[PDB]
Amino acid sequence: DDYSFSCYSQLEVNGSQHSLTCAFEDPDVNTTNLEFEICGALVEVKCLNFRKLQEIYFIETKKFLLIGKSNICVKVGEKSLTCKKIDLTTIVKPEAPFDLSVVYREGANDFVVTFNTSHLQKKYVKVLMHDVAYRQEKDENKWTHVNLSSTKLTLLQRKLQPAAMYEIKVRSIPDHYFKGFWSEWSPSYYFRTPEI
Amino acid sequence: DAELDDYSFSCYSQLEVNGSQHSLTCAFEDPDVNTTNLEFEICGALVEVKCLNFRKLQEIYFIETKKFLLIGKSNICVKVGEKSLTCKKIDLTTIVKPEAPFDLSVVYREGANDFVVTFNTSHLQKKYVKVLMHDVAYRQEKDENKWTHVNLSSTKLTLLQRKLQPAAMYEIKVRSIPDHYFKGFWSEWSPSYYFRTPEIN
Numbered sequence: 001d002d003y004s005f006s007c008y009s010q011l012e013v014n015g016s017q018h019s020l021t022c023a024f025e026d027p028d029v030n031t032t033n034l035e036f037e038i039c040g041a042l043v044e045v046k047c048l049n050f051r052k053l054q055e056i057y058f059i060e061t062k063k064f065l066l067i068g069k070s071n072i073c074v075k076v077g078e079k080s081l082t083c084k085k086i087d088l089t090t091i092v093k094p095e096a097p098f099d100l101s102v103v104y105r106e107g108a109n110d111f112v113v114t115f116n117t118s119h120l121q122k123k124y125v126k127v128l129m130h131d132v133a134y135r136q137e138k139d140e141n142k143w144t145h146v147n148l149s150s151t152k153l154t155l156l157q158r159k160l161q162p163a164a165m166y167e168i169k170v171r172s173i174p175d176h177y178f179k180g181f182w183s184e185w186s187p188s189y190y191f192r193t194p195e196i
Numbered sequence: 197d198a199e200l201d202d203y204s205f206s207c208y209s210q211l212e213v214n215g216s217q218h219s220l221t222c223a224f225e226d227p228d229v230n231t232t233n234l235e236f237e238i239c240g241a242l243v244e245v246k247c248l249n250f251r252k253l254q255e256i257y258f259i260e261t262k263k264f265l266l267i268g269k270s271n272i273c274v275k276v277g278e279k280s281l282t283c284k285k286i287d288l289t290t291i292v293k294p295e296a297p298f299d300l301s302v303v304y305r306e307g308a309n310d311f312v313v314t315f316n317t318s319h320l321q322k323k324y325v326k327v328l329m330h331d332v333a334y335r336q337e338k339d340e341n342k343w344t345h346v347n348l349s350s351t352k353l354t355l356l357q358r359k360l361q362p363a364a365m366y367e368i369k370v371r372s373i374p375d376h377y378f379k380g381f382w383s384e385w386s387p388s389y390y391f392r393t394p395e396i397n
């Protein structure tokens with residue numbers, strides 16, 4: 001009865017080409033004869049058809065203008081069920097951070113935690129905010145979160161348990177100009193703190 | 197004496213004004229302000245850089261660059277030496293001044309008793325500011341009693357002979373404003389075009 005949906009775009013996922021990914025909010029919707037289409041703010045083309053896979057709808061294309069709003073419609077045959085005007089730059093899901101690394105500096109008695117990001121967060125200069133989460137790998141229930149705009153974070157050795165395994169991971173969300181959603185978590189990094 | 201308000205300013209962008217390169221132009225609203233040690237800078241919503249400097253071109257401040265993100269708002273600051281005096285957050289897609297129309301043409305069609313008015317615009321070939329509203333203004337050459345206006349989206353208009361004075365000289369010109377997603381300001385007028393209506397029995 002309700003064909004409401006949500007989408008996320010990703011930018012430069014395969015060279016200069018972007019992607020758009022849409023799915024119904026109701027997981028039980030029969031998608032067998034429902035199609036998705038996007039029209040407007042496209043490069044020299046009126047509309048594009050999504051490809052349907054496993055209840056999800058995908059487009060991979062260079063043809064997003066990224067300036068202005070687009071119209072995304074759920075169609076059965078030619079009949080337009082529901083539509084949504086969306087600026088593709090307001091629903092961006094960043095790629096996950098990666099190559100997480102931890103360095104110990106004995107002199108400073110601290111840990112330098114770095115991670116890698118997109119080509120784009122460097123091209124588009126100040127746009128993402130990152131969320132670094134860590135916790136004692138077992139025993140401890142909830143995570144400790146630190147927000148930052150750069151790719152480098154310091155943890156004081158003496159603010160962590162000694163001789164203990166820590167788990168640490170990172171994710172990103174558009175923070176300036178762009179808007180959107182949390183990336184997937186990076187793969188976790190595990191390390192054991194110095195004994196005392 | 198001198199007041200902060202003296203340094204209020206306004207800007208306009210032109211998008212793809214030179215191939216893929218854009219422009220941004222800023223000017224103090226007061227034309228008499230001593231600008232001697234004032235510069236302009238823009239920071240934020242740029243590509244690859246944090247900040248760009250404007251060039252000063254005789255009371256006007258100008259930058260040509262491709263490096264506008266065109267997403268979100270930039271900060272445009274009056275600079276005294278290297279310190280910011282006063283700033284404005286501006287979304288560059290909301291202060292677009294189109295390039296002026298050109299190559300106006302008006303031709304009487306004998307069969308139809310009308311005049312076909314055509315003109316041209318570089319915006320036809322742009323990726324971004326592609327949709328404009330045009331304002332065509334025309335008046336008898338002998339008139340500060342003034343102008344008739346027609347608003348249109350296309351580059352071709354018809355004027356009906358029965359609506360014009362016969363055997364008379366008309367002046368006509370055209371300008372444009374952004375009309376879809378982009379917002380901003382009227383362009384300059386095309387040069388004025390002059391045509392005479394036929395005599396009538």
Ligand SMILES: *[C@@H]1O[C@H](CO)[C@H](O)[C@H](O)[C@H]1NC(C)=O
Pocket residue numbers: 010011012092093094095096097117118119120121122124125126127128
């Ligand atoms: C950086 O990368 C992620 C992929 O890792 C997203 O593509 C995101 O859009 C990028 N951030 C910026 C600033 O564009």
